[PDB]
Scaffold this active site. Structure first.
Site, PDB file in Angstrom:
ATOM      1  N   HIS A  14       0.873  -1.083  -0.132  1.00 61.98           N
ATOM      2  CA  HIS A  14      -0.010   0.078   0.057  1.00 61.98           C
ATOM      3  C   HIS A  14       0.856   1.246   0.062  1.00 61.98           C
ATOM      4  CE1 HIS A  14      -2.894  -3.000   0.574  1.00 61.98           C
ATOM      5  NE2 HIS A  14      -3.712  -2.240   0.078  1.00 61.98           N
ATOM      6  N   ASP A 111      -6.398   5.522   0.283  1.00 60.90           N
ATOM      7  CA  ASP A 111      -6.720   4.139   0.584  1.00 60.90           C
ATOM      8  C   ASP A 111      -8.110   3.735   0.341  1.00 60.90           C
ATOM      9  OD1 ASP A 111      -4.662   1.814   0.902  1.00 60.90           O
ATOM     10  OD2 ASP A 111      -6.557   1.429   2.074  1.00 60.90           O
TER      11      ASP A 111
HETATM   12  O1  LIG Z   1      13.089  -6.542  -1.397  1.00 60.28           O
HETATM   13  C1  LIG Z   1      12.095  -5.775  -1.763  1.00 60.28           C
HETATM   14  N1  LIG Z   1      12.248  -4.703  -2.245  1.00 60.28           N
HETATM   15  C2  LIG Z   1      11.246  -3.826  -2.719  1.00 60.28           C
HETATM   16  O2  LIG Z   1      11.384  -2.613  -3.054  1.00 60.28           O
HETATM   17  N2  LIG Z   1       9.862  -4.245  -2.635  1.00 60.28           N
HETATM   18  C3  LIG Z   1       8.757  -3.247  -2.906  1.00 60.28           C
HETATM   19  O3  LIG Z   1       7.628  -3.570  -2.006  1.00 60.28           O
HETATM   20  C4  LIG Z   1       6.377  -3.073  -2.826  1.00 60.28           C
HETATM   21  C5  LIG Z   1       5.268  -3.938  -2.650  1.00 60.28           C
HETATM   22  O4  LIG Z   1       5.168  -4.894  -3.180  1.00 60.28           O
HETATM   23  P1  LIG Z   1       3.798  -5.856  -3.875  1.00 60.28           P
HETATM   24  O5  LIG Z   1       2.467  -5.268  -4.136  1.00 60.28           O
HETATM   25  O6  LIG Z   1       4.282  -6.283  -5.222  1.00 60.28           O
HETATM   26  O7  LIG Z   1       3.634  -7.400  -3.198  1.00 60.28           O
HETATM   27  P2  LIG Z   1       3.196  -7.382  -1.376  1.00 60.28           P
HETATM   28  O8  LIG Z   1       2.469  -8.846  -1.515  1.00 60.28           O
HETATM   29  O9  LIG Z   1       4.432  -7.158  -0.636  1.00 60.28           O
HETATM   30  O10 LIG Z   1       2.059  -6.281  -1.405  1.00 60.28           O
HETATM   31  P3  LIG Z   1       0.579  -6.498  -1.924  1.00 60.28           P
HETATM   32  O11 LIG Z   1       0.074  -5.489  -3.163  1.00 60.28           O
HETATM   33  O12 LIG Z   1       0.106  -7.686  -2.153  1.00 60.28           O
HETATM   34  O13 LIG Z   1      -0.358  -5.550  -0.751  1.00 60.28           O
HETATM   35  C6  LIG Z   1       6.930  -3.153  -4.016  1.00 60.28           C
HETATM   36  O14 LIG Z   1       6.856  -1.847  -4.629  1.00 60.28           O
HETATM   37  C7  LIG Z   1       8.315  -3.620  -4.262  1.00 60.28           C
HETATM   38  O15 LIG Z   1       9.085  -2.950  -5.170  1.00 60.28           O
HETATM   39  C8  LIG Z   1       9.946  -5.342  -2.124  1.00 60.28           C
HETATM   40  C9  LIG Z   1      10.719  -6.234  -1.737  1.00 60.28           C
HETATM   41 BR1  LIG Z   1      10.121  -8.149  -1.159  1.00 60.28          BR
END
Ligand SMILES: O=c1[nH]c(=O)n([C@@H]2O[C@H](COP(=O)(O)OP(=O)(O)OP(=O)(O)O)[C@@H](O)[C@H]2O)cc1Br
Length: 428
Positions: A14, A111
């Site tokens: 988020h 949000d």
């Molecule tokens: O090592 C790491 N470095 C890093 O910068 N990120 C960053 O976390 C951020 C959020 O992740 P998502 O949307 O892809 O997956 P999630 O399951 O954690 O969140 P949801 O959307 O399901 O809530 C992305 O912007 C990544 O770039 C994640 C990791 Br792991």
């Protein structure tokens, strides 16, 4: 001149897109006065680090904390779901908190958890709901209050049916904690000025064309793609870049199942063994003593000889590197969009929530391929598919074209840039 409040929620998936939005609005060519609301306390210690870094690098963006007490844990309930509930429950406090700001706020970008609170409590502020998921999954979210049975697929007229396999099972239980706040908020999407989505027209054309027609989910306000939101910088570059610089082009597989604890010890071991057998170079965000005896010394050494086993990376810097040839991902939407922007082919292994529908969108868009039953044979699934993902083939080219379209969308004149400029130009 326009003062806008970006209202973030909880957890990196988020947070990131809200940081990216806040930053994009603060700068040219939008040139807004931006306040960034943060829900405190933060769910993990890591987020505190990132948020502090952001405000330092964007001194013209004002921080606004918004305290919400942690709910008491429960045997049954997921801790992230409890926290989201608490944020959703708190939302009615926002109009007073936000209207106490100076100067006059022109609009709120919020949000989804704040929807009911912002849209039903006075004073009434212009509120754009910024969803962090796909347009595809958002349309399902909007339909959750109209869910009764799980006998058949959910068929929203004008949209491709949602197979029961891909619908989060909680959504069929109205008193499941997640479903409860999904309903509460989705019931008031109709009062938002618009739904902002971190996607682009040519990535989700069927969903968006149906929505834009007025005939499908007609109670929703305009659904406005504003992505892919391009990333922030940081005052600490990615440590692995000079190692990536040493690897051949398109030779490294980036592996990440997101921020939270995703896989069991058995699953991690199997993935380890598969990666070993592939002989691929890799960077794998695993969620270093635990790992040595998890894999065993032989396997741990063999993995270390070909790749990097890490706890954290600057993901956008990894995905932007020419050495990276593919991305094994759970298909969290931020990860999908970061990969789309850089044209990196995805091997999609979704686990829960929006991930399966996101994986479907990834495959439909030609950005990657979804291995539906990956979890029935992890070692075999990676050994079989990685070479096709990492190859110089049809998929690489289709992924490359997605990257070109993604960049086109947020370049001056692009479908998303224009959309966002129109929103901002309309503002008070
Ligand atoms: O090592 C790491 N470095 C890093 O910068 N990120 C960053 O976390 C951020 C959020 O992740 P998502 O949307 O892809 O997956 P999630 O399951 O954690 O969140 P949801 O959307 O399901 O809530 C992305 O912007 C990544 O770039 C994640 C990791 Br792991």
């Amino acid at each position: 001149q326009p003062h806008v409040v970006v209202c973030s929620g909880a957890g990196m998936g988020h947070l990131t897109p809200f940081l990216n939005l806040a930053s994009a609005l603060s700068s040219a060519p939008y040139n807004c006065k931006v306040t960034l609301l943060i829900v405190i306390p933060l769910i993990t210690d890591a987020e505190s680090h990132h948020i502090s870094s952001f405000f330092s690098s964007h001194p013209t963006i004002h921080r606004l904390d918004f305290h919400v007490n942690l709910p008491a844990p429960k045997p049954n309930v997921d801790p992230f779901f409890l926290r989201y509930k608490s944020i959703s429950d708190s939302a009615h406090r926002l109009p007073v908190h936000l209207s106490a700001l100076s100067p006059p706020i022109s609009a709120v970008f919020s949000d989804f958890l704040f929807t009911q609170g912002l849209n039903t409590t006075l004073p009434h502020l212009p509120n754009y709901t910024f969803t962090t998921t796909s347009a595809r999954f958002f349309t399902l979210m909007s339909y959750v209050p109209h869910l009764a049975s799980s006998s058949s697929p959910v068929e929203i007229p004008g949209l491709e049916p949602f197979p029961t396999d891909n619908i989060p099972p909680p959504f069929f239980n109205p008193e499941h904690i997640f479903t409860s706040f999904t309903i509460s908020n989705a019931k008031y999407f109709s009062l938002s000025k618009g739904i902002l989505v971190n996607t682009f027209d040519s990535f989700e054309p069927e969903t968006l064309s149906a929505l834009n027609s007025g005939d499908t989910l007609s109670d929703l306000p305009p659904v406005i793609p504003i992505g892919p939101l391009n990333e922030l910088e940081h005052n600490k570059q990615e440590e692995l870049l000079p190692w990536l610089d040493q690897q051949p082009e398109k030779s490294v597989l980036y592996v990440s199942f997101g921020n939270r604890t995703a896989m069991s010890s058995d699953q991690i071991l199997e993935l380890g063994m598969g990666l070993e057998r592939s002989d691929c170079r890799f960077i794998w965000v695993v969620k270093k003593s635990e790992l040595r005896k998890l894999f065993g010394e032989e396997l741990y050494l063999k993995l270390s000889e070909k790749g990097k086993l890490v706890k954290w990376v600057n993901q956008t810097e990894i995905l932007g590197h020419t050495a990276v040839g593919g991305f094994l991902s759970h298909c969290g939407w931020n990860s999908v969009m970061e990969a789309a922007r850089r044209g990196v082919p995805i091997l999609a292994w979704p686990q829960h929530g929006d991930q399966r529908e996101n994986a479907w969108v990834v495959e439909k868009a030609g950005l990657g391929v979804w291995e539906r039953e990956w979890a029935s044979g992890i070692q075999a699934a990676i050994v079989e598919k990685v070479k096709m993902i990492m190859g110089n083939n049809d998929l690489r080219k289709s992924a490359m074209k997605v990257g070109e379209e993604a960049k086109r969308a947020c370049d001056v004149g692009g479908s998303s840039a224009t959309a966002l400029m129109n929103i901002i130009g309309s503002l008070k």
